[PDB]
Amino acid sequence: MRIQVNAKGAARLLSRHLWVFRRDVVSGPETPGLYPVYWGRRFLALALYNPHTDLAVRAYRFAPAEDPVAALLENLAQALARREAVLRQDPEGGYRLVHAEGDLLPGLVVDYYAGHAVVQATAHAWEGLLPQVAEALRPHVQSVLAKNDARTRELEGLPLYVRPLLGEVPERVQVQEGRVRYLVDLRAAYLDQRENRLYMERFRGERALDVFSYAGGFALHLALGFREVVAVDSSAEALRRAEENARLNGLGNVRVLEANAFDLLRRLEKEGERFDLVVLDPPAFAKGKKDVERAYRAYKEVNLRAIKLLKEGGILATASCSHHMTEPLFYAMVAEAAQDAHRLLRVVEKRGQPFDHPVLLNHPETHYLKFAVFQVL
Amino acid sequence: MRIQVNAKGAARLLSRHLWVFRRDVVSGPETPGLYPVYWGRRFLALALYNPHTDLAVRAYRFAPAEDPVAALLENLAQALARREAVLRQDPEGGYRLVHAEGDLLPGLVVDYYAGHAVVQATAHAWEGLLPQVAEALRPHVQSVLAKNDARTRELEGLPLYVRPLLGEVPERVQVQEGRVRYLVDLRAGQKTGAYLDQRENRLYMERFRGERALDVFSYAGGFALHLALGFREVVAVDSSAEALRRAEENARLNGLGNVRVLEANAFDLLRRLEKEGERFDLVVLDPPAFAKGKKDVERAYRAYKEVNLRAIKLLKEGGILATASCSHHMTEPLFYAMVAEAAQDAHRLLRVVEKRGQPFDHPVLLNHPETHYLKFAVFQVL
């Protein structure tokens, strides 16, 4: 069998985007799986297919190949290969080994936490290939956990469950990141901010504010260069993990603080508090193109306040991991904030996703992380 | 002596942009110099000013100072201070010590080439302060040249001249850049063979190895030299024989026989190389601005697209593309949009390897868009 798409679908795949939605599919199999995609008689690509979803086609090869399963597994091999260097040198670190579309492996995510891998299949065809995936990873892990409990799978028509795939999967594991260690509960920070947290180690000062600290990943690194670091978050559970990570590192200069970021910030300003550094690691504010509007204003407000709390010469590390918050808008938003706060900011560095979370230029949606460091003059 | 600006001018200085043009100035001195800027009775900033130019106000301090000259010089001191670390570690390297607006020192540029500095002023007030400028430099330099021959100086009603400010200015200097060295021409009327804002980008290219590498728009072959260390053959292309001349010279200076120059028109040569079926492991595009004005963006975009498109078509599966743009007009978003269109039209998937820009010694101010002009991107063709 094979998939047939209209001219629009063909165009998208010609321009090398990996996705073709329902509305552009003319015909195709009645069962999910791996099939060739065709525009009339013209071959376009090999892809993961699902007849019951809006996102029906996810390409992973733009070249025919006998045995589509073999080719998908080749892609897997290459993905792991790109990370061999690091897994050798830093066996105890945390790295993503498979980053879905970015690694030409749609619907599959695989992370590495100091020897223990967590697999996340999100496309129907990955479901019966897990054993193969486990067998592929095995040479580098001591465990493999199929963490297939994401709601996104229902949409595909898949079951939810977390079950070991290979070896003995620990309950929790300690991950080494630069000069600090943190705890990962393999069952329940995120690796895409790994290199940005490490960057924070180049700064020193009196006080550092870490808004939206989560498990305090940024705090941990900052505690090495500042007398005091204040990790803020709305979740007690989060700050709980933050204190625990703090203790695991023998860091007593890290102070948690349950609070609503937007309010607290206005507060530290009114009370006249000021800092040497402020990190802004907000959670996606937009759940769709619709929210962008309001999202933009939310980011501006927080960024504006953050800027107002910084001393002359202070550092601002602000970010966004939302898909709908484009890089251009992100930087426009920071600039607006800086302007309204009547403060001059020098760019210290613009960063994004690290090498293990690949970005494809032709597939915009693979780019979501924006991280920037500024100095307030 | 004060400078009065309208609400528009005030807004610009409030948002922290350093420039206020003629149209927004209500009143001010009759002679160029350093003066306070006010909106009514409200103090806004200290600034270099010129009564005879479209760009009249160039702020350098958004806080009152009793001695405008002293404050400007403190800015200079701090600019030099930010480069202290590197001047000590790499005394033989090439670094910009003062990057005009980026260092809150409008109308002043100073570069450092292994001990020899070159000063460039393009705003009136800086002229009488040149002697003090060579002073602050003295401890860090062997000599200081005053290269004041840029046409822009005429708008400011300033004389065009090239002349030493301190010490003995060499006619040529060898600069060390990582594992390579190159020649910088300080001789009057000669192009400084160095483009310091690409220093860290060239160095980056040392991480690649392969068979063939193509260096489109190689100038003095700076990128070529670094590539020569990892590829069997590097082809430096440029439309200037003079340029390729300095390229071959820099090549010999490093004992590199794997670097081959090639005088030619980039746009055509690229199309040709496709037809003869030529494919490389890595290619680099360092196009000269294609916009002498914010009105040529249109045509410029098309220009970049065509060349990028061609470059992509010449790359092997897994090849590397390092493309860039040093034009203020070609905005970052536009640049990435055009590379994307190119990749799309060429039906090739590009994985981002790294997005880069200007180095630390060429400061960018978020509130002053114009200080941002260099875009350098590395992609891998899958």
PDB file of N, CA, C and O in Angstrom, chain B residues 184-231:
ATOM      1  N   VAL B 184      48.172  42.299   8.528  1.00  0.00           N
ATOM      2  CA  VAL B 184      47.298  43.452   8.567  1.00  0.00           C
ATOM      3  C   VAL B 184      48.069  44.647   8.043  1.00  0.00           C
ATOM      4  O   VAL B 184      49.128  45.016   8.562  1.00  0.00           O
ATOM      5  N   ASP B 185      47.512  45.247   7.006  1.00  0.00           N
ATOM      6  CA  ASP B 185      48.104  46.393   6.350  1.00  0.00           C
ATOM      7  C   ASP B 185      47.653  47.719   6.948  1.00  0.00           C
ATOM      8  O   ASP B 185      46.497  48.110   6.791  1.00  0.00           O
ATOM      9  N   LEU B 186      48.573  48.414   7.615  1.00  0.00           N
ATOM     10  CA  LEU B 186      48.274  49.709   8.227  1.00  0.00           C
ATOM     11  C   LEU B 186      48.658  50.870   7.288  1.00  0.00           C
ATOM     12  O   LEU B 186      48.378  52.038   7.580  1.00  0.00           O
ATOM     13  N   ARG B 187      49.286  50.550   6.159  1.00  0.00           N
ATOM     14  CA  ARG B 187      49.709  51.576   5.207  1.00  0.00           C
ATOM     15  C   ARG B 187      48.561  52.451   4.703  1.00  0.00           C
ATOM     16  O   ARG B 187      47.498  51.958   4.317  1.00  0.00           O
ATOM     17  N   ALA B 188      48.793  53.762   4.726  1.00  0.00           N
ATOM     18  CA  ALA B 188      47.803  54.747   4.302  1.00  0.00           C
ATOM     19  C   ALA B 188      47.145  54.395   2.976  1.00  0.00           C
ATOM     20  O   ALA B 188      47.826  54.121   1.989  1.00  0.00           O
ATOM     21  N   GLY B 189      45.815  54.404   2.958  1.00  0.00           N
ATOM     22  CA  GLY B 189      45.091  54.100   1.738  1.00  0.00           C
ATOM     23  C   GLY B 189      44.984  52.618   1.435  1.00  0.00           C
ATOM     24  O   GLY B 189      44.639  52.225   0.322  1.00  0.00           O
ATOM     25  N   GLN B 190      45.276  51.789   2.427  1.00  0.00           N
ATOM     26  CA  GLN B 190      45.204  50.346   2.249  1.00  0.00           C
ATOM     27  C   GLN B 190      44.119  49.737   3.133  1.00  0.00           C
ATOM     28  O   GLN B 190      43.854  50.224   4.232  1.00  0.00           O
ATOM     29  N   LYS B 191      43.488  48.673   2.645  1.00  0.00           N
ATOM     30  CA  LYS B 191      42.439  48.009   3.408  1.00  0.00           C
ATOM     31  C   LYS B 191      43.022  47.126   4.505  1.00  0.00           C
ATOM     32  O   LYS B 191      43.839  46.244   4.234  1.00  0.00           O
ATOM     33  N   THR B 192      42.607  47.375   5.745  1.00  0.00           N
ATOM     34  CA  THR B 192      43.066  46.566   6.860  1.00  0.00           C
ATOM     35  C   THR B 192      42.614  45.161   6.471  1.00  0.00           C
ATOM     36  O   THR B 192      41.412  44.894   6.372  1.00  0.00           O
ATOM     37  N   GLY B 193      43.578  44.278   6.218  1.00  0.00           N
ATOM     38  CA  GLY B 193      43.249  42.918   5.821  1.00  0.00           C
ATOM     39  C   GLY B 193      42.531  42.104   6.883  1.00  0.00           C
ATOM     40  O   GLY B 193      42.282  40.911   6.696  1.00  0.00           O
ATOM     41  N   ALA B 194      42.191  42.752   7.996  1.00  0.00           N
ATOM     42  CA  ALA B 194      41.512  42.087   9.101  1.00  0.00           C
ATOM     43  C   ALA B 194      40.078  42.549   9.266  1.00  0.00           C
ATOM     44  O   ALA B 194      39.761  43.733   9.114  1.00  0.00           O
ATOM     45  N   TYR B 195      39.214  41.593   9.573  1.00  0.00           N
ATOM     46  CA  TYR B 195      37.808  41.865   9.800  1.00  0.00           C
ATOM     47  C   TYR B 195      37.556  41.200  11.135  1.00  0.00           C
ATOM     48  O   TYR B 195      36.984  40.117  11.217  1.00  0.00           O
ATOM     49  N   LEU B 196      38.026  41.868  12.180  1.00  0.00           N
ATOM     50  CA  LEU B 196      37.930  41.365  13.533  1.00  0.00           C
ATOM     51  C   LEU B 196      36.591  40.821  14.005  1.00  0.00           C
ATOM     52  O   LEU B 196      36.571  39.918  14.850  1.00  0.00           O
ATOM     53  N   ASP B 197      35.469  41.323  13.491  1.00  0.00           N
ATOM     54  CA  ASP B 197      34.209  40.764  13.975  1.00  0.00           C
ATOM     55  C   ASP B 197      33.968  39.301  13.571  1.00  0.00           C
ATOM     56  O   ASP B 197      33.062  38.656  14.106  1.00  0.00           O
ATOM     57  N   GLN B 198      34.793  38.774  12.663  1.00  0.00           N
ATOM     58  CA  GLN B 198      34.666  37.390  12.214  1.00  0.00           C
ATOM     59  C   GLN B 198      35.721  36.503  12.840  1.00  0.00           C
ATOM     60  O   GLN B 198      35.793  35.311  12.545  1.00  0.00           O
ATOM     61  N   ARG B 199      36.548  37.091  13.699  1.00  0.00           N
ATOM     62  CA  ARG B 199      37.618  36.357  14.373  1.00  0.00           C
ATOM     63  C   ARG B 199      37.148  35.050  15.005  1.00  0.00           C
ATOM     64  O   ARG B 199      37.649  33.976  14.670  1.00  0.00           O
ATOM     65  N   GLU B 200      36.198  35.142  15.928  1.00  0.00           N
ATOM     66  CA  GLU B 200      35.713  33.939  16.590  1.00  0.00           C
ATOM     67  C   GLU B 200      34.980  32.986  15.659  1.00  0.00           C
ATOM     68  O   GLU B 200      34.955  31.780  15.913  1.00  0.00           O
ATOM     69  N   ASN B 201      34.415  33.501  14.568  1.00  0.00           N
ATOM     70  CA  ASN B 201      33.731  32.626  13.616  1.00  0.00           C
ATOM     71  C   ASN B 201      34.744  31.822  12.808  1.00  0.00           C
ATOM     72  O   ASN B 201      34.535  30.636  12.539  1.00  0.00           O
ATOM     73  N   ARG B 202      35.845  32.455  12.421  1.00  0.00           N
ATOM     74  CA  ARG B 202      36.878  31.728  11.678  1.00  0.00           C
ATOM     75  C   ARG B 202      37.395  30.582  12.558  1.00  0.00           C
ATOM     76  O   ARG B 202      37.477  29.436  12.137  1.00  0.00           O
ATOM     77  N   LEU B 203      37.754  30.914  13.789  1.00  0.00           N
ATOM     78  CA  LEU B 203      38.259  29.934  14.727  1.00  0.00           C
ATOM     79  C   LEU B 203      37.319  28.740  14.832  1.00  0.00           C
ATOM     80  O   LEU B 203      37.757  27.587  14.907  1.00  0.00           O
ATOM     81  N   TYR B 204      36.021  29.020  14.838  1.00  0.00           N
ATOM     82  CA  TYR B 204      35.009  27.972  14.939  1.00  0.00           C
ATOM     83  C   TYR B 204      35.202  26.945  13.813  1.00  0.00           C
ATOM     84  O   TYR B 204      35.101  25.738  14.038  1.00  0.00           O
ATOM     85  N   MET B 205      35.496  27.431  12.606  1.00  0.00           N
ATOM     86  CA  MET B 205      35.669  26.547  11.458  1.00  0.00           C
ATOM     87  C   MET B 205      36.794  25.508  11.612  1.00  0.00           C
ATOM     88  O   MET B 205      36.880  24.560  10.831  1.00  0.00           O
ATOM     89  N   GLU B 206      37.643  25.673  12.622  1.00  0.00           N
ATOM     90  CA  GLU B 206      38.752  24.737  12.854  1.00  0.00           C
ATOM     91  C   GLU B 206      38.276  23.374  13.356  1.00  0.00           C
ATOM     92  O   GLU B 206      39.051  22.422  13.455  1.00  0.00           O
ATOM     93  N   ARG B 207      36.993  23.293  13.673  1.00  0.00           N
ATOM     94  CA  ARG B 207      36.412  22.068  14.191  1.00  0.00           C
ATOM     95  C   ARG B 207      35.994  21.112  13.079  1.00  0.00           C
ATOM     96  O   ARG B 207      35.539  19.992  13.337  1.00  0.00           O
ATOM     97  N   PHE B 208      36.169  21.543  11.837  1.00  0.00           N
ATOM     98  CA  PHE B 208      35.776  20.715  10.712  1.00  0.00           C
ATOM     99  C   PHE B 208      36.918  20.115   9.924  1.00  0.00           C
ATOM    100  O   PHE B 208      37.978  20.718   9.789  1.00  0.00           O
ATOM    101  N   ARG B 209      36.686  18.909   9.414  1.00  0.00           N
ATOM    102  CA  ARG B 209      37.665  18.200   8.599  1.00  0.00           C
ATOM    103  C   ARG B 209      36.962  17.618   7.377  1.00  0.00           C
ATOM    104  O   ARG B 209      35.775  17.291   7.433  1.00  0.00           O
ATOM    105  N   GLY B 210      37.691  17.494   6.274  1.00  0.00           N
ATOM    106  CA  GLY B 210      37.091  16.941   5.074  1.00  0.00           C
ATOM    107  C   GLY B 210      37.971  16.960   3.841  1.00  0.00           C
ATOM    108  O   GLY B 210      39.164  17.250   3.908  1.00  0.00           O
ATOM    109  N   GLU B 211      37.367  16.646   2.704  1.00  0.00           N
ATOM    110  CA  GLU B 211      38.077  16.619   1.439  1.00  0.00           C
ATOM    111  C   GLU B 211      38.206  18.019   0.848  1.00  0.00           C
ATOM    112  O   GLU B 211      39.281  18.618   0.867  1.00  0.00           O
ATOM    113  N   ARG B 212      37.099  18.533   0.325  1.00  0.00           N
ATOM    114  CA  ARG B 212      37.066  19.857  -0.291  1.00  0.00           C
ATOM    115  C   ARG B 212      36.223  20.879   0.473  1.00  0.00           C
ATOM    116  O   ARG B 212      35.131  20.580   0.948  1.00  0.00           O
ATOM    117  N   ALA B 213      36.742  22.095   0.568  1.00  0.00           N
ATOM    118  CA  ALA B 213      36.046  23.184   1.229  1.00  0.00           C
ATOM    119  C   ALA B 213      36.053  24.360   0.261  1.00  0.00           C
ATOM    120  O   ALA B 213      37.066  24.631  -0.384  1.00  0.00           O
ATOM    121  N   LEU B 214      34.918  25.040   0.144  1.00  0.00           N
ATOM    122  CA  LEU B 214      34.797  26.194  -0.738  1.00  0.00           C
ATOM    123  C   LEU B 214      34.578  27.457   0.103  1.00  0.00           C
ATOM    124  O   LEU B 214      33.695  27.495   0.959  1.00  0.00           O
ATOM    125  N   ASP B 215      35.385  28.485  -0.147  1.00  0.00           N
ATOM    126  CA  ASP B 215      35.302  29.742   0.588  1.00  0.00           C
ATOM    127  C   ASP B 215      34.898  30.884  -0.335  1.00  0.00           C
ATOM    128  O   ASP B 215      35.748  31.603  -0.846  1.00  0.00           O
ATOM    129  N   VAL B 216      33.600  31.056  -0.541  1.00  0.00           N
ATOM    130  CA  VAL B 216      33.096  32.121  -1.404  1.00  0.00           C
ATOM    131  C   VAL B 216      33.271  33.472  -0.692  1.00  0.00           C
ATOM    132  O   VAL B 216      32.996  33.586   0.502  1.00  0.00           O
ATOM    133  N   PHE B 217      33.713  34.494  -1.428  1.00  0.00           N
ATOM    134  CA  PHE B 217      33.960  35.822  -0.851  1.00  0.00           C
ATOM    135  C   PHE B 217      34.994  35.624   0.257  1.00  0.00           C
ATOM    136  O   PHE B 217      34.692  35.801   1.434  1.00  0.00           O
ATOM    137  N   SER B 218      36.211  35.248  -0.120  1.00  0.00           N
ATOM    138  CA  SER B 218      37.253  34.992   0.873  1.00  0.00           C
ATOM    139  C   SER B 218      38.088  36.192   1.311  1.00  0.00           C
ATOM    140  O   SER B 218      38.793  36.106   2.314  1.00  0.00           O
ATOM    141  N   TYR B 219      38.015  37.301   0.580  1.00  0.00           N
ATOM    142  CA  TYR B 219      38.805  38.484   0.923  1.00  0.00           C
ATOM    143  C   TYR B 219      40.264  38.044   1.078  1.00  0.00           C
ATOM    144  O   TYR B 219      40.799  37.351   0.217  1.00  0.00           O
ATOM    145  N   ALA B 220      40.900  38.428   2.180  1.00  0.00           N
ATOM    146  CA  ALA B 220      42.289  38.047   2.425  1.00  0.00           C
ATOM    147  C   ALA B 220      42.396  36.574   2.826  1.00  0.00           C
ATOM    148  O   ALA B 220      43.418  36.144   3.354  1.00  0.00           O
ATOM    149  N   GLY B 221      41.328  35.816   2.575  1.00  0.00           N
ATOM    150  CA  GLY B 221      41.309  34.393   2.877  1.00  0.00           C
ATOM    151  C   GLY B 221      41.336  33.951   4.330  1.00  0.00           C
ATOM    152  O   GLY B 221      41.816  32.854   4.627  1.00  0.00           O
ATOM    153  N   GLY B 222      40.818  34.785   5.231  1.00  0.00           N
ATOM    154  CA  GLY B 222      40.805  34.446   6.648  1.00  0.00           C
ATOM    155  C   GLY B 222      40.138  33.116   6.967  1.00  0.00           C
ATOM    156  O   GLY B 222      40.645  32.322   7.767  1.00  0.00           O
ATOM    157  N   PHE B 223      38.984  32.870   6.357  1.00  0.00           N
ATOM    158  CA  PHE B 223      38.299  31.616   6.594  1.00  0.00           C
ATOM    159  C   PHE B 223      39.114  30.483   5.982  1.00  0.00           C
ATOM    160  O   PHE B 223      39.292  29.429   6.608  1.00  0.00           O
ATOM    161  N   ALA B 224      39.638  30.720   4.777  1.00  0.00           N
ATOM    162  CA  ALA B 224      40.451  29.727   4.067  1.00  0.00           C
ATOM    163  C   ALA B 224      41.597  29.207   4.927  1.00  0.00           C
ATOM    164  O   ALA B 224      41.781  28.002   5.059  1.00  0.00           O
ATOM    165  N   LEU B 225      42.358  30.119   5.520  1.00  0.00           N
ATOM    166  CA  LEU B 225      43.483  29.728   6.355  1.00  0.00           C
ATOM    167  C   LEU B 225      43.117  28.711   7.436  1.00  0.00           C
ATOM    168  O   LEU B 225      43.834  27.727   7.642  1.00  0.00           O
ATOM    169  N   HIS B 226      42.005  28.949   8.130  1.00  0.00           N
ATOM    170  CA  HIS B 226      41.572  28.052   9.203  1.00  0.00           C
ATOM    171  C   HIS B 226      41.072  26.713   8.675  1.00  0.00           C
ATOM    172  O   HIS B 226      41.300  25.675   9.291  1.00  0.00           O
ATOM    173  N   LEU B 227      40.405  26.741   7.527  1.00  0.00           N
ATOM    174  CA  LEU B 227      39.893  25.527   6.915  1.00  0.00           C
ATOM    175  C   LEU B 227      41.041  24.665   6.404  1.00  0.00           C
ATOM    176  O   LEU B 227      40.998  23.433   6.488  1.00  0.00           O
ATOM    177  N   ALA B 228      42.073  25.320   5.881  1.00  0.00           N
ATOM    178  CA  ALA B 228      43.247  24.634   5.349  1.00  0.00           C
ATOM    179  C   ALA B 228      43.833  23.626   6.344  1.00  0.00           C
ATOM    180  O   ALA B 228      44.546  22.700   5.964  1.00  0.00           O
ATOM    181  N   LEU B 229      43.534  23.813   7.619  1.00  0.00           N
ATOM    182  CA  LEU B 229      44.045  22.928   8.653  1.00  0.00           C
ATOM    183  C   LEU B 229      43.263  21.614   8.778  1.00  0.00           C
ATOM    184  O   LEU B 229      43.747  20.660   9.397  1.00  0.00           O
ATOM    185  N   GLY B 230      42.061  21.560   8.205  1.00  0.00           N
ATOM    186  CA  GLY B 230      41.262  20.350   8.321  1.00  0.00           C
ATOM    187  C   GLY B 230      40.801  19.706   7.025  1.00  0.00           C
ATOM    188  O   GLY B 230      40.222  18.613   7.048  1.00  0.00           O
ATOM    189  N   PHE B 231      41.044  20.371   5.899  1.00  0.00           N
ATOM    190  CA  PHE B 231      40.643  19.837   4.608  1.00  0.00           C
ATOM    191  C   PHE B 231      41.830  19.700   3.655  1.00  0.00           C
ATOM    192  O   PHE B 231      42.750  20.515   3.683  1.00  0.00           O
TER     193      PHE B 231
END
